C-alpha cells in the first residue's frame, strides 16, 4: 500500500506498451493490406514475429519421452508435435503450430 | 382484395409454402421407423401444420405475394370485408383485460392507502383483498366510466408538481 503508485504506474506503462505493440500490429497489418502492401505486414511471410520460445517448449515436450521422461511412451499431448489421432474420421487432436498470428494473439 | 391481396384460400404461394413445410417434415420423417417417438412426433407436427393452414385459409385471411397472411388493422375495411377478428375484435379483447388488470391494481392501491403501514401491503400482498378485487373487477368498464362521470377518477391539483409548475 505504501508503493502502490510504483506498482500501478509500471502496470499502466506495460498495459500501454502491450496495447501498442499488440494491437497496433493488427492496425499496421490492416493499413498495409488495405494500401496493398502485403510485404509490409506482420505475417508469417513478410515480417515474421515467430513465437520461438513456445515453439522450443513444444519441441522440448515432444522430445521429452526420449530423454527427459524415459518411462513415458509418448508425450502428454499431441499438441507438442508428432502424429495426429483421428477417431471416426474426425481429428481428435493434432499438432498445433504457432506463427506470427499466434504471437500477436498471445500478446 | 382489399389492398391488392389475394385470399389465402386461393393464393398459390400459400399452398406452395404449405407443401414446402410438409416436404421438410416428411424429409425428416423418412429417416425414422414406422411407429417410433420421432415418427409420431413428426406426424403430429405435420397434422398441426395442415390444420393450421386449413384454419387460416378458412378464416378468410388475405395473403400477399409471399403467401403469408396479412392482417387488416383498419376498422371499416375490416368490418366491411369480413376481417374484424384479425386486429379489430382482438383490440377490445385486449383492452378489456388490460384495463381489468389496471383497474384491479388501482383498486388495490386505493384500498391499501388507508391502512397503518401501506407500504408493507405492497411488498406483502393482501391476497384476500387482492383476490376479492380481482374477482369483482370484471365490471371495470362500467365502474370506470361511473368513476369518471362522478369526477372521482382523477385527482385534483393536489398533485406534486415542480417549481415552474
Amino acid at each position: 500500500i505504501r508503493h502502490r503508485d510504483a506498482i500501478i504506474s509500471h502496470l499502466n506503462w506495460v498495459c500501454i506498451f502491450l496495447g501498442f505493440h499488440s494491437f497496433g500490429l493488427y492496425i499496421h497489418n490492416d493499413t498495409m493490406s488495405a494500401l496493398g502492401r502485403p510485404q509490409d505486414m506482420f505475417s508469417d511471410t513478410a515480417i515474421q514475429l515467430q513465437p520461438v520460445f513456445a515453439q522450443w517448449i513444444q519441441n522440448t515436450h515432444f522430445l521429452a519421452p526420449q530423454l527427459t521422461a524415459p518411462n513415458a511412451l509418448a508425450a502428454t499431448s499431441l499438441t507438442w508435435g508428432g502424429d495426429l489421432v483421428a477417431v471416426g474420421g474426425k481429428v481428435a487432436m493434432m499438432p498445433i503450430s504457432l506463427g506470427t498470428s499466434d504471437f500477436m494473439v498471445h500478446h | 382484395d382489399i389492398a391488392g391481396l389475394t385470399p389465402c384460400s386461393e393464393s398459390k404461394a400459400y399452398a406452395k409454402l404449405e407443401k414446402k413445410e410438409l416436404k421438410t417434415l416428411e424429409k425428416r420423417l423418412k429417416q425414422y421407423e414406422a411407429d417410433s417417438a420421432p415418427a409420431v412426433a413428426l406426424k403430429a407436427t405435420m397434422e398441426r401444420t395442415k390444420a393450421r393452414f386449413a384454419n387460416y385459409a378458412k378464416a378468410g385471411l388475405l395473403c400477399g405475394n409471399d403467401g403469408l397472411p396479412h392482417l387488416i388493422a383498419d376498422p371499416g375495411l375490416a368490418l366491411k370485408y369480413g376481417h374484424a377478428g384479425e386486429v379489430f375484435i382482438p383490440t377490445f379483447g385486449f383492452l378489456y383485460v388490460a384495463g381489468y388488470i389496471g383497474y384491479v391494481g388501482r383498486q388495490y392501491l386505493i384500498a391499501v392507502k388507508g391502512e397503518a403501514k401501506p407500504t408493507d401491503k405492497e411488498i406483502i400482498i393482501d391476497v384476500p383483498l387482492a383476490t376479492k378485487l380481482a374477482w369483482q373487477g370484471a365490471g371495470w368498464p362500467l365502474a370506470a366510466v361511473q368513476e369518471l362521470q362522478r369526477g372521482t377518477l382523477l385527482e385534483k391539483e393536489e398533485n406534486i408538481t415542480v417549481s415552474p409548475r
Binding site: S9, T31, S33, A34, G36 | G4, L17, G64, L71, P164
Partner: protein, 733 residues
C-alpha cells in the same frame, strides 16, 4: 500562473490544468458566457461569425467545383452519364502500394481517384454545365464571393459599421427582405438561369455569358409575357423521345406543367422546375411585402401575436409577450431555425429520392443513398440542436414574468402531461414493435412464416391510391378515373404524375407491405422517444423535484452530487446527450429501411424485402450480413480492390464508436487516480523528470468526457454506416 489562451474567460485562463485547453476550445462560441460581453457585442460577433460561415461554405463549394473540374471527368461524364463514374478528386497518398494505385484508378483516370457520391456531377449537368471551364469559372466566382463575405465580416466589425442592437432586433424589415429578396428574387433569378441557360443547354443549345444577350429563351420573346398570353410559354414541351443535352425531340417551351419525370433521365423536367421557381418567386415576393417598414404600410408582428389570444383563454394570455420573448432571445430563434431547417432537410431527403431533380440521378444508386443518408443524419443532428437550444432558452433567456400566462408558460405548467404522454407513446410503440418483430422472428425460427403478425399498412396504401397508385385498388381520388380531382388536372400534371407513380422502377411512392408498417412504427418509436428525451430536458431544464434550482446551475453542469439519491446526467445538456443516441438510432433505422428497400428495388428483388423485413434476422442476415460481403473483402490476404478504403473506414468507425464507449462507461475518478500515479511516475523517473508539464494533467471532466464519448460514438456510427453504404452500393453497382 495566469495563462493567455482563453481570452474570453479569465476563470479558465487561471486554470493550472489541462481543463483550460479543452474548455476554451469548447466555450469559444458561447459568446454570451464570455467575459465582458454585452448584448450588442454578442449580436455583432454573431453577425461576423455568420459572415465567416458563409465564406467557409462558399470556399467549400469552390473547392468541390475546382476538384471536379481539375481531377474529375465532367467533360467525359456528360457524354455517357449512365456508364461513367463521377470522379470527386484525385489521390496522392505516399503510403499507397502499387496495388492500391492500380485499384483506385477508376472512372477513366490516369491515376488513383475517388468516385464521387455527392451528386454534384448530376446537379451541375442539369443546371447547364457541360465544360470543365464552366466549373473552373464557378469556383473562381464562389471563392470571390467567399472573399467578399469575409471582408464584410471584417467590415461590419468596424466602429462606424458595427450595427446597433436594435438593428438586429428589427424583425419586420429583416423578414420582409429575407422573404422577398433572399427567397423570391433569388428564386426569380434561378428561374432566369433555368430558362436562359439550363433549359437550352438541355436542348443542346449552348448558352453562356458570351451569347445569353444574343439568343432568346423562347421563339416569341416576352410578347407572351407583357400581353398576358402566358400559355404560349407552355407551347411545345420536351417530348418523351427527348434525350438530355442534345436537340433530339427538344421542344421550345420553358414553363411547362407536365409533372412526373423526364423519360431518359428519370428526373424532373427543367421546364416545370423553371415554372416552380417562378411561382415560388412571385409567392415569396408577395409574401415579403407583409411586415411594416419605413413606408407606413404593413404588419407589426407584436400586434399579430398580441391579437391572437383566443376567447376562453384556452391558450391563456395567447401569444401576448411572445414578440419580446423571441426577439430578445437568440436561442429561441436558433431553435426555431434549427427545427425548420432540420424539417426541410428531411423534406429534401424524402423528396430528392422519390422526385429526383437532377438528370442521370436515380440511376446513380450510390449517389442517391449517400444523399439521403447524409441529409437525414444532418436533419437529425439539426433537430436535436433545435431542442437543445430550446432548453438553453428556457434556462438563459426565459423570463417567467414577461411570459405570464402565455402559451410558452402554459407549456411549462403542464410539462408533466407532455412528458408522460410522450413516454406512453414511446413505451407503447416500443413494446409493440419489438413484440411483433420478435414474434415474427420466433415464427421464422420455428419454421412457420405464416404465423407472423403481418399488418398491411392500409392507411398509407390508401393515401398512395389517393395519389393515383392503382396497385391496391382503392379507386379513391386520382386512381379513380371518374373523379373530380382526376378530371380537373388531366390537362396538367396528372399524365406525367400517374405515369411516374404507377411505374414501379422509380422511387416515387414505392409499394409497401407489413415490413414497411413495422419499420415505420419503429421510426415513430425513435421520433417520439428522441423528442421525449429532448422535450423532457427542455421543460425540466429549469427545474425538477430532484433539483428545482437547476436554472441556477446553467445548461451544462456535471451533476448535483451523489446526494438526494444521485444526480448523474441531470442537466438538460445531458438530456440532449442521451437523446443524440436515440436520434442516431432513429436515423439508422430510417436509413437502413431506405437502403434495403432500394437495394432490393435496384436488384429487382423487392420480394426479398417484402419477405425478410418483417423479422429482424432478415435485417441482420439478408441486409447487414449479405451486403457486407464485398465491403469486408475490400482487402484480404490475397489482395485488395477499390473498396479497401471503405473497408478500412468501416473498421475505423467500429474503432471510434467503441472508443467512445470508453468515455461513456468509465467515468472520471478511475482516470484521475490513474493520472495521479502517472504524475508520480513522471516526477520520479530519471532523465524524464527533466521534462515537466506546464498544464497539470487531469482527467477529462464529466461533461467533457460525455461530449467526447458522444463524439467518438457519432463519428464511428457515421463513418461505419457511410463506408457500408457506399461500399455495398458501389460494389454491386
Amino acid at each position: 500562473a495566469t495563462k493567455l489562451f482563453p481570452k474570453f474567460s479569465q476563470g479558465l485562463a487561471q486554470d493550472p490544468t489541462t481543463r483550460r485547453i479543452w474548455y476554451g476550445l469548447a466555450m469559444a462560441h458561447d459568446f454570451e458566457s464570455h467575459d465582458g460581453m454585452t448584448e450588442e457585442n454578442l449580436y455583432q460577433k454573431i453577425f461576423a461569425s455568420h459572415f465567416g460561415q458563409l465564406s467557409i461554405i462558399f470556399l467549400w463549394t469552390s473547392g468541390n467545383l475546382f476538384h471536379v473540374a481539375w481531377q474529375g471527368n465532367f467533360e467525359q461524364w456528360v457524354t455517357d452519364p449512365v456508364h461513367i463514374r463521377p470522379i470527386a478528386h484525385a489521390i496522392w497518398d505516399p503510403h499507397f502500394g502499387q496495388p492500391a494505385v492500380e485499384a483506385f484508378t477508376r472512372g477513366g483516370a490516369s491515376g488513383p481517384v475517388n468516385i464521387s457520391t455527392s451528386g454534384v456531377y448530376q446537379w451541375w449537368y442539369t443546371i447547364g454545365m457541360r465544360t470543365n471551364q464552366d466549373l473552373y469559372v464557378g469556383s473562381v466566382f464562389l471563392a470571390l464571393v467567399s472573399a467578399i463575405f469575409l471582408f464584410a465580416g471584417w467590415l461590419h466589425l468596424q466602429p462606424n459599421f458595427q450595427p446597433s442592437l436594435s438593428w438586429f432586433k428589427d424583425a419586420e424589415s429583416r423578414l420582409n427582405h429575407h422573404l422577398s429578396g433572399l427567397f423570391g428574387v433569388s428564386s426569380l433569378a434561378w428561374t432566369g438561369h433555368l430558362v436562359h441557360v439550363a433549359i437550352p443547354e438541355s436542348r443542346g443549345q449552348h448558352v453562356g455569358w458570351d451569347n445569353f444577350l444574343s439568343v432568346l429563351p423562347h421563339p416569341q420573346g416576352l410578347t407572351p409575357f407583357f400581353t398576358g398570353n402566358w400559355a404560349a410559354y407552355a407551347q411545345s414541351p420536351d417530348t418523351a423521345s427527348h434525350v438530355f443535352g442534345t436537340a433530339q425531340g427538344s421542344g421550345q417551351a420553358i414553363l411547362t406543367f407536365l409533372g412526373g419525370f423526364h423519360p431518359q433521365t428519370q428526373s424532373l423536367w427543367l421546364t416545370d422546375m423553371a415554372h416552380h421557381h417562378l411561382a415560388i418567386a412571385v409567392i415569396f415576393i408577395v409574401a415579403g411585402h407583409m411586415y411594416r417598414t419605413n413606408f407606413g404600410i404593413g404588419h407589426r408582428m407584436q400586434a399579430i401575436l398580441e391579437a391572437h389570444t383566443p376567447p376562453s383563454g384556452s391558450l391563456g394570455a395567447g401569444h401576448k409577450g411572445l414578440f419580446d420573448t423571441v426577439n430578445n432571445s437568440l436561442h429561441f430563434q436558433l431553435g426555431l431555425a434549427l427545427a425548420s431547417v432540420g424539417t426541410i432537410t428531411s423534406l429534401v431527403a424524402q423528396h430528392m429520392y422519390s422526385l429526383p431533380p437532377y438528370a442521370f440521378q436515380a440511376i446513380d444508386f450510390t449517389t442517391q443513398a449517400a444523399l439521403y443518408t447524409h441529409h437525414q443524419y444532418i436533419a437529425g443532428f439539426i433537430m436535436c440542436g433545435a431542442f437543445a437550444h430550446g432548453a438553453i432558452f428556457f434556462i438563459r433567456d426565459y423570463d417567467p414574468e414577461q411570459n405570464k400566462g402565455n402559451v410558452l408558460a402554459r407549456m411549462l405548467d403542464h410539462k408533466e402531461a407532455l412528458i408522460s404522454h410522450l413516454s406512453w407513446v414511446s413505451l407503447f410503440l416500443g413494446f409493440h414493435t419489438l413484440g411483433l418483430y420478435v414474434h415474427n422472428d420466433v415464427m421464422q425460427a420455428f419454421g412457420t412464416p405464416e404465423k407472423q403478425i403481418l399488418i398491411e399498412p392500409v392507411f398509407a396504401q390508401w393515401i398512395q391510391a389517393a395519389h393515383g397508385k392503382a396497385l391496391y385498388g382503392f379507386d379513391f381520388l386520382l386512381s379513380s378515373k371518374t373523379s373530380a380531382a382526376f378530371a380537373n388536372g388531366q390537362s396538367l400534371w396528372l399524365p406525367g404524375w400517374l405515369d411516374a407513380i404507377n411505374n414501379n422502377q422509380n422511387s416515387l411512392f414505392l409499394t409497401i407491405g407489413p415490413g414497411d408498417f413495422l419499420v415505420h412504427h419503429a421510426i415513430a418509436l425513435g421520433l417520439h422517444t428522441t423528442t421525449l428525451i429532448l422535450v423532457k430536458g427542455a421543460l425540466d431544464a429549469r427545474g425538477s423535484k430532484l433539483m428545482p434550482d437547476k436554472k441556477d446551475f446553467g445548461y451544462s453542469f456535471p451533476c448535483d452530487g451523489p446526494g438526494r439519491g444521485g444526480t448523474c446526467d441531470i442537466s438538460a445538456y445531458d438530456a440532449f446527450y442521451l437523446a443524440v443516441f436515440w436520434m442516431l438510432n432513429t436515423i439508422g433505422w430510417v436509413t437502413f429501411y431506405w437502403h434495403w428497400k432500394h437495394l432490393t428495388l435496384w436488384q429487382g428483388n423487392v420480394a426479398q424485402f417484402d419477405e425478410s423485413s418483417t423479422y429482424l434476422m432478415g435485417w441482420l442476415r439478408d441486409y447487414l450480413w449479405l451486403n457486407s460481403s464485398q465491403l469486408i473483402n475490400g482487402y484480404n490476404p490475397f489482395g485488395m480492390n477499390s473498396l479497401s478504403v471503405w473497408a478500412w473506414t468501416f473498421l475505423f468507425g467500429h474503432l471510434i464508436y467503441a472508443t467512445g464507449f470508453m468515455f461513456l462507461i468509465s467515468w472520471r475518478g478511475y482516470w484521475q487516480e490513474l493520472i495521479e500515479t502517472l504524475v508520480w511516475a513522471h516526477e520520479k523517473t530519471p532523465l524524464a523528470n527533466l521534462v515537466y508539464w506546464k498544464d497539470k494533467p487531469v482527467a477529462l471532466s464529466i461533461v467533457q468526457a460525455r461530449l467526447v464519448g458522444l463524439a467518438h460514438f457519432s463519428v464511428g456510427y457515421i463513418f461505419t454506416y457511410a463506408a457500408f453504404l457506399i461500399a455495398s452500393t458501389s460494389g454491386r453497382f
